[model samples]
Target: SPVRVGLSVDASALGHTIPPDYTGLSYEQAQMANPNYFSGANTQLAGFLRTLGRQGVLRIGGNTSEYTFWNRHAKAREVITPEAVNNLSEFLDKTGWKLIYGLNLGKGTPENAADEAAYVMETIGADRLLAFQLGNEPDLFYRNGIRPASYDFAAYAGDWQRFFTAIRKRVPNAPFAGPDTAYNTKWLVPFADKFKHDVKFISSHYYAEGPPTDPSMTIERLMKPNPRLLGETAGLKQVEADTGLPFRLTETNSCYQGGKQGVSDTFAAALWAGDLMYQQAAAGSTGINFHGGGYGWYTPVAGTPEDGFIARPEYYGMLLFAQAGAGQLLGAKLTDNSAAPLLTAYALRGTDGRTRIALFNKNLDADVEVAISGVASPSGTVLRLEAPRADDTTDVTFGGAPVGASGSWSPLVQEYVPGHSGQFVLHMRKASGALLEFA
Candidate 1:
């Protein structure tokens, strides 16, 4: 029996438009300090970003954000320089991407954070800077030795207030977002409650699976339905309903602790990571940032400027999302949702007046016949997201082409699929994805 998928796409139903910046990259603050990499001079790197999307978000913070300081303070002789910000400014302009600058919270003083925020705002300019994140995973401060064993949310909140006040004095209109918690929603919930009005968006970090050393973290486990994600998204929706504030997963990736090498770097990461992006977008997330830098196991754009940056399997996932993510996300449904955990589908009424549908079949051993209905017309094209095996890393291609060193990706294979009576038949191979678009 075919899986029956239906879409309620009105010709002009102006539903929510998934922002152009919906698919983004999150980097450790340390990346900015390296002028050679994320700099405008690194034309290749900038080209790769431009290829990802014309306008997107670049989150400049991660675990290292807690440790990164600005040089103007001269407090610890350990900080990213002002020139780094200059390079960052040019890079942002070159790529046409916005910034979510992070200020050190765990190890630095409020005064230092203020001065650093001022410099970033001045250098990056007001419009280019989306929001200044004051901390990174503050909930994990106790474990990381930044906070004492007895430290709790109350103490953390007090510290946050000090930094907020300090930055306010330096830059009165600095847009802010908060409670950059690693895994504690208990902290996130209350933080939203107390500081809802003071912030721009609620923020959090999520790692579907983690710690490369864990023996149980395998590709098979990576593809399973994640209760953590379901629970967290549900909880986030509640927070939005309660406080009326938008949310963004400021930092997230396949696995934490630098991601498991084989699992995070493989073609499967594209399937999993791309699937994760659509899930969050439908769940009403304002943005989703994939954390990567320095060719870490899950780094999307692996390699460096001098070495030649290449789009990893994870990068294709982001690229796939960008092709259709910027549009009015329309209503889609799966009636005979068999292998429910292993299959997913989405339809977007694109900004260009095209209807694009994405389907994913993650079941490793079972092919699915997907019957799609409510298609816009009788003519359309399907781009297969293919890989040799679930664990294969390099042999992956979306639209039958790989991203080049120059960041140019011309989809070479788009199979024409004809719709009959506003419906079409799709053969989704096991462990693959496809994007069907009616242009």
Candidate 2:
């Protein structure tokens, strides 16, 4: 099948830069229960983060944030301390990544929320602190017992405004955004409109697969495309166009409850992980914060204080993105649609003046043949993300190298391929991904 390089390829003058903060991770507040888990001394973890990129985001909070208290004087069991803030900032300093801190809303009062925001501003500072999220998945509050059954967006918005006013009074010029609705796709546009000038960007959460307990949440289901997410993202694009505020999926992963152990930890998850980046990037999203940490089955980097941290298979998916995700998105599309409905591809005009293309094969039974153009180099490099099988967890590698426990990764077996004047052929194997770069 033929892939068409879009406009300005002839000119090489039109493109959009994928922001530095585009790559990110979301962690539970409890991950910091010990504080040292995220402290500056965690060099292995920092190394893993730096492996992703020098520039990225670290989102603090999730379901745990809503319940984690702000009190530290008497010392609550689930409270965050000033030293924790200092350690977190220290950790960010180590990786040179920014922060998007979340505040308690479900069970938290606005006054304390303001205090915590002020303290974060004081510690993390403006340069490192990206934005303050008022809550995590506020829309789900009602269903989960935090909000009353009658509670809805209108009510949530009112509470958000109140918190915004209080936080602003303390910090004066705080940056914020969200209704951080979990599946409340319709609420995003209105929230963006309501807080258009009040936020740096809009955000939400997504989980491709679900609750590990579900019988149907299998590896095969994890590999295919989710059309509903495409539709939801198309809707988000509308918010961007209408309000001009880019939306970021602040929290997302393969499965919701940490993740499904076998599926999320397997090499197949690496294929899904890489493709989701291209899928969302092409959809006009500016950023993604893959939720991880704790005992989650699909965290990007998985480990503990006693055992030390190592890159999980999903980390390879993110590592794959770091290879070409730094460039600007080029308009690339496929004209030959086949039975492999999940087959997809994307192109990026890299800052290094090379054209980078990512091809994904999500079809379980057939490979996808892709003819790529707009490359003039005689030869290029292909970085293959693969393993022995889809369910193989510990055997995954990207470009023939595994990320060491210390966070070091170097391609050991990259394939050098021949290219014609401006064309190349890519045979993407089922359940695999390839990153091709040409000058």
Candidate 3:
């Protein structure tokens, strides 16, 4: 059975302009994935990113960001060198992307941090660089035994200032964004207020659930919306309103501590991620960086360099978001006429006057016949995202096509049927999503 719903999108009442570089990927330093991965050497990965959008940001840092060390000579467990910097520079150049580089803070000195910063700026050029994050989630230092439980934001501010002063000396007027926190989102506003002029963006992290070992954690739980998302963003939005700056989810994914084996790496996660990007954009996020890598449990790309990169189900969700959220975000209204609460929708108005509506039918067993009332056109084309089941790993498709191992995706389209009075109905299948574009 299908459910009836109504949606209205007003181009006259538009919101923020979703940045072209709104999507990003995060990697950990411990992975030692090599800077060449970012370089043009990985044509598959590079080609895939181009397919998504013209611009994006590659965020380099994670829990291991603190453990990393940089040097003119290599000797440590994790030492980034000038050669790696050169490769990274080439990578950013080749991809037409920028970087949000994270400097060491937990076990690094200001001088050493400056050394890396200087080398990176000189090698990569400042324009290609987005900003330098001073640390990777300073709020967890106490829990990790890196800082005292008594070590509060005031202390973090001082230490951050010291690093900022040092890096500024090396790369004068270096851009920065930070206080990347996993838990304490409370630190964002104060940090933003104190360093208002110096910072370009404020950042935080989010995970639907944890360490992957919690008995209560389930794919069902991950599917539901987290109140903390809107709750925390309330304060962040206030800060952005007061300071006139944008914020970002610099590090985030389905679960913390890498992610669950079956859940985070499944088709459900892909659906969840697609919904999440719209949620964050509605909440006024500048962008989102999905944490992934070869070692990452919820890796978007899986496989060895020799074997070739494989796009995961979650990657398709990201790809959908990149396409659907191409231009300015428009205000949308949804009228639910059913008890299931199984659907969600988003609308975007392209610069060229095209209206794109993204629909997510979360119902597990029932198909939804969504009635759209506000579209000005009589017909449109829909790109669908489908899979065998929510938990299924294989046979996932966006627009009736699977993204190839060679980084190729050719979307198949379905034309919509028209109805009366500026309205139309879309046959949205169960546990599936669609992107509707009105010309």
Candidate 4:
């Protein structure tokens, strides 16, 4: 018999709808790549996101957003065109997804941001546009010399308001989400005070650790929880209360500066992402967008849009989360008797009364036997997420199978093991996760 552990779940307690849009992606505007990435041309990429949900949000902007200049005359390093707009519109139509367009605020005029905003809205339509972001990660503007040394939140806000006014002048009643910041949680309150009326979702970015080349960035470090995220999100509810709007992690990933090579591109990243998604949802966040692109150091898909895209390990984690977290969130308690702090469980009560438990074992060694306490059915299926090793990039799977290149996937089920005296026991391997569904 496995070690017996006590746990309970309250199906009656529920949280937010946990929308399919809960799983999202953030990309650089440059990756638009003549719309090959978004339109039906890349059937594989479009199909993958479509399978996730009917209402996923794609955020188009990153550090490149500031660097990009929408040249109606095609003079800069990158230029916006009507052809890309048409293809993106078509892509959004086919996939039923929305967009959060980020306009350039660094080294670009308010007139240009307004022009691009109007052009995008005219082409993509308001129904598909979630919100307009004036800038990307403005808190770093001064540090990066995009703004003067005297620059602060107050100065950033003033610049943002100018851009906001220009866009609204072109398209009145436009919805916005912003103060896109890598740090400076303090900006949320002041940003809300100034633009709460126009803002739809308070947006921010998070990274567990970063710069890819940093000596401190490692797989072990990426796997552990960070106090930075906890401190930043601690006051989200208060921000929502004050602003009367939900907050969104519009951009995030395992590590910053395109993620570390071995750490972020491995199976362990998927596990970390799955766990992070639940953490954000629990913290009252409405959505999370994992940033990736073809040229990006850390990307969920590889190759040019014209050449075709292959899903990465991080992509699989998001896919698993999209499928498992489809119902109302339910409260769950896991009593771990294991000597190490390596396991965590999240539960959801389906509309059909079935309970879905996502069990994650983050330990690098030593499998643990988990005894679940509040299952209504004696028999159910366990979908395992495993790889030969946590760092393995090629052998990752959900439920013992991999997602096809064309985005086809069938659940590979493991018959549940009988529990002692009505409790269910699951043998969880180290450095893997499982989705257990019960009636």
Candidate 5:
């Protein structure tokens, strides 16, 4: 069926750390340490939000938050670092986007979260930000030894209850969403079972395959959506069903733990990514966050907003979904999956009366034919993203390059080209995808 899919980006995934050699950071050094970074804030954030579009959500804070970082050690009198406020406030002004900020749940007291919550609300203005999560992936934190490995959900629940009660006392009517867990379904089922009405939404993360430890799950396989990916998320979806809570896979990406060198950042990642969004929407998902940022330890997509802003393959994947027009999903399905089993298809009808379908050919060497029926034939543009080698860096190309550049601004929104003879033909390569639009 036609689907309305959205992408998720964590604020923590926004900036790359500057090494001793590098002098500047994108709103990171300024907003966090100094207040001077706000000067050129609009130029950077506007370029970013434009890439993300207004329909998406920008989740701020992550494990760094648990350290009371966003609040700067909760020096209430300090409020914002001036530069931090300028960067965020200006970014919001340009994008008109909302947020779901993660607060420290571990090693953090209710008073601490409450103080930060009040400050965030007052500084960012409550209306601009959407929801506040107590933390990011508390389930994994315990596993990672960031929290005690023996910690149980019941104990976690108590902590959350205490935290929620306190935040409630502060924000009173503030909207909330979470139990942000990395691949843990228990957070939603148990927590929401009791606090469903008290919370706004459920959040979680998923990485189809990660760390690149297994040879079977190589960068090539990462481009194709596995049946296992669906199986993995089934339990999480059930929790949403049982609790009547609209859920979001608040964080997800091609591969986890610094995304594999050649796999996570490739055109194939974009194809698989586009398929993921449509798949999640079909599974009754509210949204999907494609985690991006730095490449170092504790950092996501490794790079800065300056020289590093150049677009990666996965960035193009997000752009394909972002360009999908507004529309009620029309009933649609894919055929010929058996012939070319690796090919993935995602079709949607926008509210604009236009139809968009993305096709991913994961065969690594073959092209796929896309046949559309029931809906009128498409006569618009076909945006393609591909490169010579799976690991090729400079060769990565998209939408004839007219629609994209090599930099961070690589995600492009362009006019759909027309010239299909009823059944549309998409020339997806071994590890690539295309965004097809119909008028």
Candidate 6:
């Protein structure tokens, strides 16, 4: 597939032994336990890397991964397991892709970070690792007692400067990337502006909505496009122009705090993500990683990793982007329509003499008819992912077989090229998503 979509997945969600102190286990834990839990060991890491080889980039470090942390309570805590430190590196080696390893700025000492960096360079071969974030999300590190204050930009820059200085002295050739916060764009901009010289990329995170506890935060409200996200990047663009630092959305998703049931991991979310990635990437952002895992019942994909990580409707939305997202990305404009706004679309000219068109069906109940302005589709197929139960992400199945065909639910997971219209008219079944490819 010429178009490739990548996931920003939590490795711990791949499977992990829930620490005794941790609470609210994932649906994977509550029901079935898949032995695959965070097995970042050499062999297992190789397996996972093989799966993602040509698909997308992997962003490591989240709530569970403490960067260089190995608390006494962890499974093999006393001695830093070769498996733990080399986990992400092994995957990067096998996949032949880039790496963005988060460092221990929030907890571990600077000396400890140097040790970690040295170990990573030795094992993963520094050439494979792309960029390194000083910490996962220093915005929430106050609770961990790293800095006395909350996520202050000055404090962050200070703390990061300390770690960066140390790491640079140890491995002066090491390149850096940062501001891996899950939210709060305000902090990201100033931090990017001030530290552009030292940093290679400005990064931030955004979820479509927060937990449903705030009854006021409606799905439609969250669904509405926020120009501010792009606006935030616009500022980074100016900074990049002057300082030459690239920017990335880094992490994103439909909902935060384990994802809201109906809002995230829904058909609507698929459309939302499809458009979001294109918008951000075209506007000068490198890429956007969707934060996902079976964190809770509200997770976008409902099942545990047991059923080979049940793909949510949004996964298909992402796959469409990854598969159809190649070639020069063009500028996009969504038409204003109260009932059904025009979907965001992009075309990739493949090396194999094919034109791949990726389209987002943004309307709540409209199947969009898109015409690639001046392009001609000599031959192509539209791959679609949609369903009735957005609430149950387990209902999410990939593969391009007919709805009730014999091999529809077979072990052969990927279904491709269901009969599609050359005119590019597709029914987006309420809040679903699709991808069109020509070859």
Please report the candidate that would top lDDT against the real structure: 1
lDDT tens string, model 1, 39-121? 88889878878888888889988778767778873322246887888889999999999889888888888998898888888
Q: For model 3, where is the 10-residue window of minimal lDDT?
A: 30-39
RMSD of 5: 8.5
Alpha-carbon lDDT, every model: 0.81, 0.79, 0.79, 0.78, 0.58, 0.53
> 1-439, model 2: which lDDT tens digit per residue?
3332221133253456777678888888766667788888888899999889778989887888878876546333388887788789899999999988888877898999899888889988999988898888877787678888887778888889999999999998788868675445446778888889899988878888644465657888877667668777877888889888988888988877667778888887888888887778767677788988855678888888678998888888888889775777776666564566666677787777788877777676666666666567777789988777788878888888888876899889958765555667677676777888875
Per-residue lDDT of 171-280 in model 5, one digit per residue for the tens? 88667887776544465568778778878777766777743455634656775656666765687677767878767777776666656666666556666666776667
Give me the overall lDDT of model 4: 0.78
For 49-158, candidate 6 gives per-residue lDDT tens digits of: 23222434455556543433632233411234445545545445555556566666766777777666666666666677666778777777766665566568888888
lDDT of 2: 0.79
- RMSD of each predicted structure: 2.5, 3.0, 2.1, 2.3, 8.5, 9.6
Local error of candidate 5 at 170, Å? 1.7
Q: Residue 243, candidate 3: how far off, in angstroms?
A: 2.7
Which run of 10 residues does model 2 get worst, by summed lDDT?
2-11
Predicted candidate 2, C-alpha RMSD: 3.0
After superposition, candidate 6 runs with Cα above 4 Å error:
1-55, 64-80, 143-146, 182-186, 210-219, 294-308, 331-338, 351-353, 371-373, 389-392, 397-428
lDDT: the better of candidates 2 and 3: 3
Q: Candidate 3, residues 46-116: lDDT per residue as tens digits?
A: 77666666688888888788788887675235777767787788777777878899988877899898888
RMSD of 6: 9.6
Candidate 2 at 188: error in angstroms?
A: 2.4
In terms of TM-score, the best-performing candidate is: 3
TM-scores of all predicted structures:
0.94, 0.92, 0.94, 0.93, 0.81, 0.75
Clashes of 1: 0
